[PDB]
C-alpha cells in the first residue's frame, strides 16, 4: 500500500495514544485531589445515617 495508508493510520495511532496518555495523567492527579480534599463523588467513606436517630420525646427533659 502507498504512503497515505500508513501516514493517516499512524496519525490515528498517535492521536489516540496521546489522548490516552493525557487522560491517564489527569486521572492520577484527579484521584490524588479527591483523596486529599474529599469533595468528590468517589473516595467517600461511610458515615452514620441520621434516620437512625430518634426525635421522640424521652423520659428526661434535657436531651
Amino acid at each position: 500500500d502507498g504512503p497515505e495508508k500508513n501516514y493517516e493510520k499512524t496519525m490515528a495511532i498517535l492521536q489516540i495514544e496521546a489522548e490516552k496518555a493525557e487522560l491517564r495523567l489527569k486521572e492520577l492527579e484527579v484521584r490524588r485531589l479527591m483523596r486529599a480534599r474529599g469533595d468528590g463523588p468517589w473516595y467517600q467513606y461511610p458515615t452514620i445515617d441520621k434516620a437512625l436517630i430518634d426525635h421522640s420525646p424521652k423520659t428526661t427533659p434535657d436531651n
Partner: protein, 57 residues
Amino acid sequence: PGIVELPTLEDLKVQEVKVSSSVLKAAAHHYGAQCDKPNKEFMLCRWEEKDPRRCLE
C-alpha cells in the same frame, strides 16, 4: 469557649411545698386534676426550651 449563664440567687427564690412524700401521693390524683395548667405549661417549656435556666419562671 464561652460563658455559663445562670440566673442569680434572688431569681431562684420561692417557698417550696414542704409536705412529705405520703401527703403528696395521697393528694396527687386531685392535685393532677386541679393544677394541671401550670404543670402542663411548665413541662412543655422544659421539653421545648430544653434548658431550665430559660424556664425558671
